[PDB]
């Protein structure tokens, strides 16, 4: 069981015009809880802030529907499911840029056992 701490996490949003593209952003903070992504040995993936589940799916057999791409210390996730796709991204917490970059790189490693991770 390996978990990494997150600074922010964002959902891609398509605002109706009365479309324009925005991100619904979440930030880890004392009044809000800490963003934490965890990867179970089984092959399950979660993103949670305190006691609320933000993301939850199974990495196994996900080459077909789930693509993720790394950039620096950020992962972007794109998921197609019953012919409807969507995105969310994440920025790994860390003391510096050198600290955080590690944990992101650790994670894309841990991810590799189930999906390939585009990496520039």
């Amino acid at each position: 069981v390996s978990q990494w701490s997150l600074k922010r996490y964002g959902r891609f949003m398509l605002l109706d015009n009365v479309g324009s593209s925005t991100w619904k952003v979440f930030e880890s903070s004392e009044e809000s809880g800490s963003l934490v992504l965890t990867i179970v040995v089984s092959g399950h993936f979660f993103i949670s802030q305190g006691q609320t589940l933000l993301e939850g799916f199974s990495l196994i057999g996900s080459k077909n529907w789930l693509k993720i791409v790394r950039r620096m210390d950020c992962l972007l996730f794109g998921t197609t499911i019953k012919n409807k796709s969507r995105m969310f991204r994440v920025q790994f917490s860390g003391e510096s840029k050198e600290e955080a970059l590690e944990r992101c790189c650790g994670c894309v490693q841990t991810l590799a056992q189930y999906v390939t991770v585009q990496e520039p």
Binding site: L14, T38, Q51, T52, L53, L54, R71, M87
Partner: protein, 48 residues
């Protein structure tokens, strides 16, 4: 539906459902996907 298995050590009580506005057709995403892919917009993913 939503994830039918959660380990006990996560301590999850609430689930933030998926907004119908977050589900886009598979190609409008892929346009938006390709943007963050390319080198022209490297660092455009660390925007926030």
């Amino acid at each position: 539906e939503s994830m039918q298995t959660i380990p006990h050590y996560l301590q999850i009580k609430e689930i933030l459902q998926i907004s119908k506005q977050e589900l886009l057709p598979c190609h409008v995403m892929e346009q938006h996907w390709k943007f963050y892919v390319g080198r022209s917009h490297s660092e455009a993913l660390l925007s926030w």
